[PDB]
Short mmCIF file of C-alpha atoms in Angstrom, two decimals:
data_model
loop_
_atom_site.label_atom_id
_atom_site.label_comp_id
_atom_site.label_asym_id
_atom_site.label_seq_id
_atom_site.Cartn_x
_atom_site.Cartn_y
_atom_site.Cartn_z
CA UNK Z 29 -10.23 -11.24 16.46
CA UNK Z 30 -9.00 -7.74 15.70
CA UNK Z 31 -5.75 -7.31 13.83
CA UNK Z 32 -3.86 -4.07 14.41
CA UNK Z 33 -1.70 -3.51 11.33
CA UNK Z 34 1.41 -1.43 11.91
CA UNK Z 35 4.97 -0.76 10.80
CA UNK Z 36 6.44 1.69 13.33
CA UNK Z 37 5.04 1.70 16.87
CA UNK Z 38 4.18 5.25 17.99
CA UNK Z 39 2.52 6.20 21.30
CA UNK Z 40 -0.79 6.14 19.43
CA UNK Z 41 -0.33 2.45 18.59
CA UNK Z 42 0.85 1.63 22.11
CA UNK Z 43 -2.26 3.26 23.53
CA UNK Z 44 -4.33 1.14 21.13
CA UNK Z 45 -2.56 -2.03 22.32
CA UNK Z 46 -3.11 -1.08 25.97
CA UNK Z 47 -6.76 -0.13 25.58
CA UNK Z 48 -7.54 -3.34 23.68
CA UNK Z 49 -5.93 -5.32 26.49
CA UNK Z 50 -7.88 -3.36 29.10
CA UNK Z 51 -11.15 -3.74 27.18
CA UNK Z 52 -10.76 -7.48 26.76
CA UNK Z 53 -10.96 -7.07 23.00
CA UNK Z 54 -9.36 -10.13 21.36
CA UNK Z 55 -6.61 -8.88 19.07
CA UNK Z 56 -3.12 -9.42 17.69
CA UNK Z 57 -0.33 -7.16 16.46
CA UNK Z 58 0.54 -7.57 12.78
CA UNK Z 59 3.86 -6.17 11.55
CA UNK Z 60 3.01 -5.27 7.94
CA UNK Z 61 6.55 -4.94 6.53
CA UNK Z 62 7.03 -8.69 7.05
CA UNK Z 63 3.49 -9.74 6.12
CA UNK Z 64 3.38 -11.91 3.00
CA UNK Z 65 0.55 -10.55 0.87
CA UNK Z 66 -0.08 -13.13 -1.81
CA UNK Z 67 -3.52 -12.92 -3.44
CA UNK Z 68 -5.42 -16.15 -3.06
CA UNK Z 69 -3.67 -17.24 0.15
CA UNK Z 70 -4.31 -15.77 3.57
CA UNK Z 71 -1.05 -15.42 5.59
CA UNK Z 72 -0.62 -17.34 8.84
CA UNK Z 73 -0.32 -13.96 10.58
CA UNK Z 74 -3.97 -13.32 9.73
CA UNK Z 75 -5.30 -16.65 10.98
CA UNK Z 76 -8.34 -15.91 13.12
CA UNK Z 77 -8.53 -12.25 12.08
CA UNK Z 78 -12.11 -10.98 11.59
CA UNK Z 79 -11.46 -7.24 11.37
CA UNK Z 80 -8.39 -5.04 11.02
CA UNK Z 81 -7.33 -1.57 12.13
CA UNK Z 82 -4.93 -0.07 9.59
CA UNK Z 83 -2.28 1.78 11.61
CA UNK Z 84 0.81 2.03 9.38
CA UNK Z 85 2.79 5.25 9.47
CA UNK Z 86 3.58 4.81 5.78
CA UNK Z 87 0.59 5.70 3.58
CA UNK Z 88 1.77 3.61 0.66
CA UNK Z 89 2.16 0.57 2.93
CA UNK Z 90 -1.12 1.16 4.76
CA UNK Z 91 -3.16 1.53 1.58
CA UNK Z 92 -1.54 -1.52 -0.02
CA UNK Z 93 -2.31 -3.55 3.10
CA UNK Z 94 -5.88 -2.24 3.33
CA UNK Z 95 -6.39 -3.24 -0.32
CA UNK Z 96 -5.02 -6.72 0.45
CA UNK Z 97 -7.38 -7.19 3.40
CA UNK Z 98 -10.34 -6.36 1.14
CA UNK Z 99 -9.15 -9.07 -1.27
CA UNK Z 100 -9.19 -11.51 1.67
CA UNK Z 101 -12.69 -10.39 2.60
CA UNK Z 102 -11.54 -9.02 5.95
CA UNK Z 103 -13.15 -5.71 6.93
CA UNK Z 104 -10.48 -3.02 7.40
CA UNK Z 105 -11.04 0.21 9.29
CA UNK Z 106 -10.64 2.87 6.77
CA UNK Z 107 -11.20 1.01 3.61
CA UNK Z 108 -8.82 1.66 0.71
CA UNK Z 109 -11.13 4.27 -0.77
CA UNK Z 110 -11.14 6.29 2.47
CA UNK Z 111 -7.37 6.11 2.85
CA UNK Z 112 -6.74 7.35 -0.69
CA UNK Z 113 -9.63 9.84 -0.62
CA UNK Z 114 -7.90 11.28 2.46
CA UNK Z 115 -4.19 11.12 1.62
CA UNK Z 116 -4.73 12.87 -1.70
CA UNK Z 117 -5.69 16.54 -1.26
CA UNK Z 118 -7.30 16.85 -4.68
CA UNK Z 119 -9.25 13.66 -4.06
CA UNK Z 120 -10.35 14.98 -0.68
CA UNK Z 121 -11.30 18.46 -2.00
CA UNK Z 122 -13.25 16.83 -4.85
CA UNK Z 123 -15.09 14.62 -2.33
CA UNK Z 124 -15.99 17.67 -0.23
CA UNK Z 125 -17.25 19.61 -3.25
CA UNK Z 126 -19.49 16.71 -4.33
CA UNK Z 127 -20.90 16.58 -0.81
CA UNK Z 128 -21.48 20.34 -1.04
CA UNK Z 129 -19.30 21.07 2.00
CA UNK Z 130 -17.55 24.39 2.72
CA UNK Z 131 -13.80 24.64 2.09
CA UNK Z 132 -11.23 27.22 0.96
CA UNK Z 133 -11.43 28.14 -2.74
CA UNK Z 134 -9.40 25.31 -4.28
CA UNK Z 135 -7.94 24.53 -7.72
CA UNK Z 136 -5.53 22.12 -9.41
CA UNK Z 137 -3.03 22.81 -12.18
CA UNK Z 138 -1.31 20.08 -14.21
CA UNK Z 139 1.65 22.11 -15.49
CA UNK Z 140 3.79 25.01 -14.29
CA UNK Z 141 2.20 27.68 -16.50
CA UNK Z 142 -1.42 27.01 -15.53
CA UNK Z 143 -0.39 27.04 -11.87
CA UNK Z 144 0.86 30.61 -12.35
CA UNK Z 145 -2.31 31.71 -14.15
CA UNK Z 146 -4.47 30.31 -11.36
CA UNK Z 147 -2.44 31.84 -8.55
CA UNK Z 148 -2.53 35.15 -10.41
CA UNK Z 149 -6.31 34.81 -10.83
CA UNK Z 150 -6.72 33.89 -7.16
CA UNK Z 151 -4.73 36.96 -6.22
CA UNK Z 152 -1.89 36.87 -3.72
CA UNK Z 153 -1.22 35.75 -1.18
CA UNK Z 154 -2.14 32.18 -2.17
CA UNK Z 155 -1.32 28.74 -0.78
CA UNK Z 156 0.48 25.89 -2.54
CA UNK Z 157 0.42 22.44 -0.93
CA UNK Z 158 1.74 19.05 -2.09
CA UNK Z 159 -1.08 16.89 -3.50
CA UNK Z 160 0.17 13.99 -1.37
CA UNK Z 161 2.73 30.37 1.46
CA UNK Z 162 3.34 32.26 -1.79
CA UNK Z 163 3.75 35.97 -1.02
CA UNK Z 164 3.81 37.37 -4.56
CA UNK Z 165 4.31 36.40 -8.21
CA UNK Z 166 8.07 36.45 -7.66
CA UNK Z 167 7.80 33.95 -4.81
CA UNK Z 168 5.39 31.87 -6.89
CA UNK Z 169 7.80 31.72 -9.83
CA UNK Z 170 10.67 30.84 -7.51
CA UNK Z 171 8.71 28.03 -5.84
CA UNK Z 172 7.39 26.68 -9.14
CA UNK Z 173 2.54 7.92 -9.52
CA UNK Z 174 -0.74 9.69 -10.30
CA UNK Z 175 0.88 12.70 -8.64
CA UNK Z 176 3.29 13.75 -11.38
CA UNK Z 177 3.30 17.54 -11.87
CA UNK Z 178 0.16 18.48 -9.97
CA UNK Z 179 -0.14 21.79 -8.12
CA UNK Z 180 -2.77 22.07 -5.41
CA UNK Z 181 -3.71 25.76 -4.99
CA UNK Z 182 -5.88 27.31 -2.26
CA UNK Z 183 -6.89 30.84 -1.32
CA UNK Z 184 -5.24 32.28 1.79
CA UNK Z 185 -7.81 32.32 4.58
CA UNK Z 186 -8.19 34.87 7.38
CA UNK Z 187 -8.80 33.07 10.66
CA UNK Z 188 -10.84 35.00 13.28
CA UNK Z 189 -10.76 31.77 15.27
CA UNK Z 190 -8.36 28.91 15.99
CA UNK Z 191 -8.20 25.79 13.84
CA UNK Z 192 -10.24 22.85 15.08
CA UNK Z 193 -9.42 19.14 14.80
CA UNK Z 194 -12.46 16.91 15.26
CA UNK Z 195 -12.12 13.18 15.91
CA UNK Z 196 -14.88 11.35 14.04
CA UNK Z 197 -15.74 7.71 14.67
CA UNK Z 198 -18.49 6.45 12.40
CA UNK Z 199 -21.47 8.80 12.52
CA UNK Z 200 -20.23 10.49 15.71
CA UNK Z 201 -17.87 13.38 16.38
CA UNK Z 202 -16.45 12.18 19.72
CA UNK Z 203 -13.95 14.90 20.60
CA UNK Z 204 -12.35 18.09 19.33
CA UNK Z 205 -9.34 20.27 20.11
CA UNK Z 206 -8.13 23.78 19.29
CA UNK Z 207 -4.73 24.44 17.75
CA UNK Z 208 -3.46 22.59 22.36
CA UNK Z 209 -6.80 23.03 24.13
CA UNK Z 210 -10.07 21.13 24.40
CA UNK Z 211 -12.80 22.35 22.05
CA UNK Z 212 -16.23 21.56 23.52
CA UNK Z 213 -18.07 20.13 20.51
CA UNK Z 214 -21.04 22.14 19.28
CA UNK Z 215 -23.89 21.03 17.01
CA UNK Z 216 -22.43 22.99 14.08
CA UNK Z 217 -18.90 21.63 14.35
CA UNK Z 218 -20.06 18.08 15.06
CA UNK Z 219 -22.47 17.90 12.09
CA UNK Z 220 -19.98 19.37 9.59
CA UNK Z 221 -17.23 17.02 10.75
CA UNK Z 222 -19.39 13.92 10.39
CA UNK Z 223 -20.51 15.06 6.96
CA UNK Z 224 -16.88 15.60 5.95
CA UNK Z 225 -16.08 12.08 7.22
CA UNK Z 226 -18.99 10.72 5.20
CA UNK Z 227 -17.85 12.63 2.11
CA UNK Z 228 -14.56 10.74 1.90
CA UNK Z 229 -16.20 7.35 2.50
CA UNK Z 230 -16.75 7.14 6.24
CA UNK Z 231 -14.84 5.43 9.02
CA UNK Z 232 -12.42 6.85 11.56
CA UNK Z 233 -10.90 10.20 10.63
CA UNK Z 234 -9.72 13.52 12.05
CA UNK Z 235 -11.38 16.50 10.38
CA UNK Z 236 -9.36 19.73 10.45
CA UNK Z 237 -11.51 22.87 10.24
CA UNK Z 238 -10.85 26.60 9.83
CA UNK Z 239 -12.93 29.14 11.76
CA UNK Z 240 -12.85 31.72 8.96
CA UNK Z 241 -14.63 34.97 8.17
CA UNK Z 242 -16.96 32.97 5.91
CA UNK Z 243 -17.62 30.53 8.75
CA UNK Z 244 -16.52 26.92 9.24
CA UNK Z 245 -14.42 25.57 6.37
CA UNK Z 246 -13.11 22.01 5.98
CA UNK Z 247 -9.35 22.09 5.51
CA UNK Z 248 -8.33 18.42 5.56
CA UNK Z 249 -9.41 14.91 6.54
CA UNK Z 250 -6.92 12.39 8.00
CA UNK Z 251 -7.38 8.62 7.51
CA UNK Z 252 -5.05 7.48 10.33
CA UNK Z 253 -5.67 10.10 13.03
CA UNK Z 254 -3.06 10.79 15.71
CA UNK Z 255 -4.45 11.30 19.21
CA UNK Z 256 -1.72 10.71 21.82
CA UNK Z 257 -2.00 14.22 23.30
CA UNK Z 258 -5.73 14.68 22.66
CA UNK Z 259 -6.82 11.97 25.07
CA UNK Z 260 -5.55 13.99 28.02
CA UNK Z 261 -6.62 17.30 26.44
CA UNK Z 262 -10.18 16.21 25.64
CA UNK Z 263 -10.72 13.70 28.42
CA UNK Z 264 -12.20 11.34 25.84
CA UNK Z 265 -11.12 7.72 25.34
CA UNK Z 266 -10.39 8.09 21.63
CA UNK Z 267 -8.39 4.81 21.38
CA UNK Z 268 -11.20 2.83 22.98
CA UNK Z 269 -13.83 4.41 20.72
CA UNK Z 270 -11.77 3.54 17.65
CA UNK Z 271 -11.34 -0.09 18.74
CA UNK Z 272 -15.02 -0.55 19.57
CA UNK Z 273 -16.03 0.84 16.19
CA UNK Z 274 -13.67 -1.52 14.36
CA UNK Z 275 -14.78 -4.49 16.47
CA UNK Z 276 -18.43 -3.74 15.58
CA UNK Z 277 -17.65 -4.13 11.86
CA UNK Z 278 -16.21 -7.57 12.56
CA UNK Z 279 -17.35 -10.39 10.29
CA UNK Y 5 -22.08 17.99 -26.11
CA UNK Y 6 -19.11 15.66 -25.75
CA UNK Y 7 -15.82 17.02 -24.51
CA UNK Y 8 -12.70 15.14 -25.58
CA UNK Y 9 -10.07 15.87 -22.92
CA UNK Y 10 -6.49 15.63 -24.12
CA UNK Y 11 -2.93 16.90 -23.64
CA UNK Y 12 -0.89 15.40 -26.49
CA UNK Y 13 -2.65 14.54 -29.76
CA UNK Y 14 -1.82 10.98 -30.84
CA UNK Y 15 -3.29 9.21 -33.90
CA UNK Y 16 -5.82 7.67 -31.51
CA UNK Y 17 -7.12 11.11 -30.58
CA UNK Y 18 -7.16 12.26 -34.21
CA UNK Y 19 -9.23 9.23 -35.18
CA UNK Y 20 -11.62 10.13 -32.37
CA UNK Y 21 -11.91 13.70 -33.68
CA UNK Y 22 -12.54 12.44 -37.22
CA UNK Y 23 -15.13 9.80 -36.26
CA UNK Y 24 -17.05 12.27 -34.09
CA UNK Y 25 -17.15 14.67 -37.03
CA UNK Y 26 -18.31 11.90 -39.37
CA UNK Y 27 -20.90 10.66 -36.88
CA UNK Y 28 -22.40 14.08 -36.33
CA UNK Y 29 -21.76 13.76 -32.61
CA UNK Y 30 -21.64 17.28 -31.11
CA UNK Y 31 -18.27 17.68 -29.42
CA UNK Y 32 -15.34 19.97 -28.70
CA UNK Y 33 -11.64 19.46 -28.02
CA UNK Y 34 -10.48 20.48 -24.53
CA UNK Y 35 -6.73 20.97 -23.94
CA UNK Y 36 -6.40 19.93 -20.29
CA UNK Y 37 -2.97 21.46 -19.51
CA UNK Y 38 -4.51 24.93 -19.91
CA UNK Y 39 -7.90 24.14 -18.38
CA UNK Y 40 -8.51 26.07 -15.17
CA UNK Y 41 -9.88 23.56 -12.67
CA UNK Y 42 -11.27 25.57 -9.79
CA UNK Y 43 -13.78 23.75 -7.63
CA UNK Y 44 -17.08 25.59 -7.50
CA UNK Y 45 -16.70 27.25 -10.89
CA UNK Y 46 -17.08 25.50 -14.23
CA UNK Y 47 -14.50 26.73 -16.80
CA UNK Y 48 -15.64 28.47 -19.98
CA UNK Y 49 -14.02 25.64 -21.93
CA UNK Y 50 -16.63 23.29 -20.45
CA UNK Y 51 -19.67 25.41 -21.26
CA UNK Y 52 -22.27 23.15 -22.86
CA UNK Y 53 -20.38 19.94 -22.03
CA UNK Y 54 -22.67 17.07 -21.03
CA UNK Y 55 -20.20 14.16 -21.13
CA UNK Y 56 -16.44 13.84 -21.39
CA UNK Y 57 -13.99 11.34 -22.87
CA UNK Y 58 -10.79 11.38 -20.80
CA UNK Y 59 -7.95 11.03 -23.32
CA UNK Y 60 -4.82 12.50 -21.69
CA UNK Y 61 -1.52 10.69 -22.28
CA UNK Y 62 -0.44 11.60 -18.74
CA UNK Y 63 -2.21 9.42 -16.14
CA UNK Y 64 -1.73 11.95 -13.36
CA UNK Y 65 -3.28 14.68 -15.49
CA UNK Y 66 -6.11 12.45 -16.78
CA UNK Y 67 -7.09 11.21 -13.33
CA UNK Y 68 -6.96 14.73 -11.85
CA UNK Y 69 -9.15 15.97 -14.70
CA UNK Y 70 -11.57 13.04 -14.40
CA UNK Y 71 -11.91 13.80 -10.69
CA UNK Y 72 -12.61 17.47 -11.48
CA UNK Y 73 -15.34 16.55 -13.96
CA UNK Y 74 -17.05 14.45 -11.29
CA UNK Y 75 -16.98 17.49 -9.00
CA UNK Y 76 -18.74 19.46 -11.76
CA UNK Y 77 -21.30 16.69 -12.11
CA UNK Y 78 -20.22 15.94 -15.69
CA UNK Y 79 -20.12 12.22 -16.53
CA UNK Y 80 -16.59 11.21 -17.60
CA UNK Y 81 -15.78 8.07 -19.52
CA UNK Y 82 -13.68 6.10 -17.23
CA UNK Y 83 -14.52 7.56 -13.94
CA UNK Y 84 -11.68 8.33 -11.51
CA UNK Y 85 -12.12 4.97 -9.80
CA UNK Y 86 -11.63 3.09 -13.06
CA UNK Y 87 -8.60 5.11 -14.09
CA UNK Y 88 -6.87 4.49 -10.76
CA UNK Y 89 -8.08 0.89 -10.46
CA UNK Y 90 -6.41 0.37 -13.85
CA UNK Y 91 -3.21 2.42 -13.64
CA UNK Y 92 -2.29 0.74 -10.35
CA UNK Y 93 -1.32 -2.92 -10.78
CA UNK Y 94 -1.96 -3.84 -7.14
CA UNK Y 95 -5.35 -2.12 -7.29
CA UNK Y 96 -6.16 -3.96 -10.51
CA UNK Y 97 -5.01 -7.37 -9.19
CA UNK Y 98 -7.02 -6.83 -6.01
CA UNK Y 99 -10.14 -5.95 -8.04
CA UNK Y 100 -9.66 -9.09 -10.15
CA UNK Y 101 -9.29 -11.29 -7.07
CA UNK Y 102 -12.44 -9.83 -5.45
CA UNK Y 103 -14.31 -10.57 -8.68
CA UNK Y 104 -12.90 -14.10 -8.52
CA UNK Y 105 -11.20 -13.79 -11.93
CA UNK Y 106 -8.15 -15.79 -13.09
CA UNK Y 107 -4.73 -14.14 -13.12
CA UNK Y 108 -1.07 -15.02 -12.51
CA UNK Y 109 -0.14 -15.76 -8.88
CA UNK Y 110 0.42 -12.22 -7.59
CA UNK Y 111 1.85 -10.65 -4.44
CA UNK Y 112 2.97 -7.31 -3.04
CA UNK Y 113 5.88 -6.53 -0.71
CA UNK Y 114 6.33 -3.22 1.10
CA UNK Y 115 10.08 -3.45 1.77
CA UNK Y 116 13.15 -4.94 0.08
CA UNK Y 117 13.52 -7.95 2.41
CA UNK Y 118 9.93 -9.21 2.12
CA UNK Y 119 10.21 -8.88 -1.66
CA UNK Y 120 13.13 -11.33 -1.58
CA UNK Y 121 11.30 -13.79 0.68
CA UNK Y 122 8.29 -13.78 -1.65
CA UNK Y 123 10.29 -14.24 -4.84
CA UNK Y 124 12.20 -17.03 -3.14
CA UNK Y 125 8.90 -18.62 -2.08
CA UNK Y 126 7.47 -18.18 -5.58
CA UNK Y 127 10.54 -19.87 -6.97
CA UNK Y 128 12.50 -18.50 -9.91
CA UNK Y 129 12.06 -17.30 -12.46
CA UNK Y 130 9.67 -14.62 -11.17
CA UNK Y 131 8.42 -11.31 -12.54
CA UNK Y 132 8.82 -7.87 -10.98
CA UNK Y 133 6.78 -4.99 -12.41
CA UNK Y 134 6.40 -1.36 -11.33
CA UNK Y 135 3.18 -0.84 -9.38
CA UNK Y 136 2.43 2.21 -11.55
CA UNK Y 137 3.35 2.94 -15.16
CA UNK Y 138 12.25 -11.59 -15.12
CA UNK Y 139 14.25 -12.38 -11.97
CA UNK Y 140 16.59 -15.30 -12.70
CA UNK Y 141 17.92 -15.92 -9.19
CA UNK Y 142 18.29 -14.36 -5.73
CA UNK Y 143 21.28 -12.36 -6.98
CA UNK Y 144 19.24 -10.88 -9.82
CA UNK Y 145 16.39 -10.23 -7.38
CA UNK Y 146 18.65 -8.37 -4.95
CA UNK Y 147 20.15 -6.34 -7.79
CA UNK Y 148 16.73 -5.38 -9.17
CA UNK Y 149 15.32 -4.55 -5.73
CA UNK Y 150 18.30 -2.30 -5.00
CA UNK Y 151 17.98 -0.67 -8.43
CA UNK Y 152 2.76 9.02 -3.51
CA UNK Y 153 0.96 5.90 -2.31
CA UNK Y 154 3.59 4.01 -4.30
CA UNK Y 155 6.61 4.43 -2.02
CA UNK Y 156 8.57 1.18 -1.68
CA UNK Y 157 6.06 -1.27 -3.13
CA UNK Y 158 7.17 -4.37 -5.01
CA UNK Y 159 4.68 -6.06 -7.30
CA UNK Y 160 5.62 -9.72 -7.74
CA UNK Y 161 4.11 -12.26 -10.14
CA UNK Y 162 4.89 -15.87 -11.03
CA UNK Y 163 6.54 -16.43 -14.42
CA UNK Y 164 3.94 -17.86 -16.78
CA UNK Y 165 4.46 -20.36 -19.60
CA UNK Y 166 2.53 -19.25 -22.68
CA UNK Y 167 1.35 -22.05 -25.02
CA UNK Y 168 -0.51 -19.31 -26.87
CA UNK Y 169 0.03 -15.68 -27.85
CA UNK Y 170 -1.04 -12.79 -25.61
CA UNK Y 171 -4.43 -11.30 -26.44
CA UNK Y 172 -5.53 -7.68 -26.11
CA UNK Y 173 -9.30 -7.30 -26.03
CA UNK Y 174 -10.98 -3.93 -26.54
CA UNK Y 175 -13.97 -3.64 -24.23
CA UNK Y 176 -16.62 -0.93 -24.55
CA UNK Y 177 -19.21 -1.12 -21.82
CA UNK Y 178 -20.64 -4.63 -21.64
CA UNK Y 179 -19.20 -5.59 -25.02
CA UNK Y 180 -15.87 -6.96 -26.18
CA UNK Y 181 -15.76 -5.37 -29.64
CA UNK Y 182 -12.40 -6.48 -31.01
CA UNK Y 183 -9.24 -8.40 -30.13
CA UNK Y 184 -5.71 -8.84 -31.40
CA UNK Y 185 -2.81 -11.26 -30.92
CA UNK Y 186 0.65 -10.05 -29.96
CA UNK Y 187 0.07 -7.90 -34.58
CA UNK Y 188 -2.80 -10.03 -35.86
CA UNK Y 189 -6.58 -10.05 -35.57
CA UNK Y 190 -7.92 -12.39 -32.90
CA UNK Y 191 -11.45 -13.50 -33.79
CA UNK Y 192 -13.30 -13.09 -30.49
CA UNK Y 193 -14.61 -16.28 -28.91
CA UNK Y 194 -17.26 -16.65 -26.20
CA UNK Y 195 -14.61 -17.53 -23.60
CA UNK Y 196 -12.32 -14.59 -24.34
CA UNK Y 197 -15.19 -12.11 -24.69
CA UNK Y 198 -16.86 -13.07 -21.41
CA UNK Y 199 -13.65 -12.97 -19.38
CA UNK Y 200 -12.69 -9.62 -20.86
CA UNK Y 201 -16.01 -8.02 -20.01
CA UNK Y 202 -15.88 -9.44 -16.49
CA UNK Y 203 -12.37 -8.02 -16.07
CA UNK Y 204 -13.65 -4.63 -17.30
CA UNK Y 205 -16.52 -4.85 -14.80
CA UNK Y 206 -14.14 -5.83 -11.98
CA UNK Y 207 -12.25 -2.52 -12.22
CA UNK Y 208 -15.47 -0.47 -12.41
CA UNK Y 209 -16.61 -0.68 -16.02
CA UNK Y 210 -16.23 1.64 -18.97
CA UNK Y 211 -13.83 1.58 -21.90
CA UNK Y 212 -10.72 -0.51 -21.37
CA UNK Y 213 -8.26 -2.84 -23.10
CA UNK Y 214 -7.91 -6.18 -21.30
CA UNK Y 215 -4.59 -7.98 -21.83
CA UNK Y 216 -4.80 -11.76 -21.43
CA UNK Y 217 -2.31 -14.62 -21.27
CA UNK Y 218 -3.11 -17.93 -22.98
CA UNK Y 219 -1.29 -19.99 -20.34
CA UNK Y 220 -1.01 -23.66 -19.44
CA UNK Y 221 -3.67 -23.04 -16.78
CA UNK Y 222 -5.90 -21.38 -19.35
CA UNK Y 223 -6.85 -17.74 -19.85
CA UNK Y 224 -5.36 -15.35 -17.30
CA UNK Y 225 -5.99 -11.62 -16.95
CA UNK Y 226 -2.64 -9.82 -17.02
CA UNK Y 227 -3.63 -6.13 -17.04
CA UNK Y 228 -6.48 -3.69 -17.74
CA UNK Y 229 -5.83 -0.31 -19.44
CA UNK Y 230 -8.06 2.74 -18.75
CA UNK Y 231 -7.10 4.80 -21.82
CA UNK Y 232 -6.68 2.11 -24.51
CA UNK Y 233 -4.55 2.74 -27.58
CA UNK Y 234 -6.01 1.50 -30.86
CA UNK Y 235 -4.37 3.27 -33.80
CA UNK Y 236 -3.06 0.03 -35.38
CA UNK Y 237 -5.89 -2.23 -34.19
CA UNK Y 238 -8.55 -0.52 -36.29
CA UNK Y 239 -6.89 -1.75 -39.48
CA UNK Y 240 -5.89 -5.07 -37.89
CA UNK Y 241 -9.33 -5.94 -36.52
CA UNK Y 242 -11.42 -4.14 -39.11
CA UNK Y 243 -13.53 -2.76 -36.24
CA UNK Y 244 -14.39 0.94 -35.74
CA UNK Y 245 -13.01 1.12 -32.20
CA UNK Y 246 -12.96 4.97 -32.11
CA UNK Y 247 -16.59 5.15 -33.21
CA UNK Y 248 -17.66 2.56 -30.65
CA UNK Y 249 -15.93 4.48 -27.86
CA UNK Y 250 -17.57 7.78 -28.85
CA UNK Y 251 -21.07 6.26 -29.07
CA UNK Y 252 -20.67 4.66 -25.65
CA UNK Y 253 -19.60 7.99 -24.12
CA UNK Y 254 -22.38 9.90 -25.85
CA UNK Y 255 -24.92 7.42 -24.44
CA UNK Y 256 -23.90 8.34 -20.88
CA UNK Y 257 -24.50 12.02 -21.67
CA UNK Y 258 -26.55 13.95 -19.14
#
């Protein structure tokens, strides 16, 4: 049966519980904080579990649990690699570059000085985001585990259009929204979103895009997509699609 | 040519520089802290670079740089996956378990309370190590527990009795090239060599130092290091560890 791993129940999780019940999809709720994860011995909580949906609000907890499930041989939706490829901006930007996908000009500095040189080279205004808006050099200076002293820098992008969030399930873009309003999926947006999903390892993710002057650019990819408002907005059963995908990977 | 990526020059790095020079292996030193890493545009510092040896003391810097090199299509010794599979104890223990390799009983808690339950279940004494970079009783446990993807994680291991000394094996590719006791030279045996190479393979392969426990239950893999230190081991083992590392890297050149 399906195991829905969680720590804090949000409306997203409740919708998952309700859809599973309505779909007749055998499942059980697994409270991760109290789950004993001893290598070599499957917990009683996981007895009968053939596939798991990793829904923890905490990234550290979710990734640690996804890693554990792989050690037990239980397929987990959004494998460890996808979760970390997504929750780490440098990792995600690197994955997009290797897949040759469009994104804002991006760079990474490993010390304060190089960060300044890069921002200066990029020309202001520039963007500085945590790996896991600078107006001028003055603002830059003022602002200034494997994440010790890293500075993720991106060019500031002009947006002729609204940002788009695309919900990708497997090889299909199933819904999209503007940033909220429904964004009727087009061939262009759908194909780019699925390729972005593939770039980070595949699975169930929300791809955030920028409709810039240079065209569609991939901004970020989320490994544990939130969709409570999007169901009504898009009219698409996102929770049900997610559950069916996970259930299909069952072993 | 080979690019040796570094931040702080330790004797290990100097030996690498000297062996490369003596071997006639075309290379250049690349100071990572000042390297501009912009995706889509290879830095001038990397002009002509066909393979890189990731030697930064800082793990965060080394992993970020290894990732960058993969984006540039430049092979890097100890790919990002290996560096992170190694610098993260839970990741490394999980990789060892999937490869079916022996190691101390290991567990991970994601909150203070579960950590206590586990330690209690393991029975004291138990070991508590930081996930990245001995509990006597419940009281000690509570005290210790109170004192990015690593927020609130508690790596717990059983306390192991060691009838023998700990062994550090230097693995280069599919070969265990040297080993030391913990320092004295540890003449490599079939058993130790095979386990060490399998442990290296389990985390993704490359150049790593495998630390083993000679316990009552036999050989157990304790940890795997992605940027092995070897300044003292060269003299201790009599093996040219730096040279072996460089030749392995150079062979992956593209």
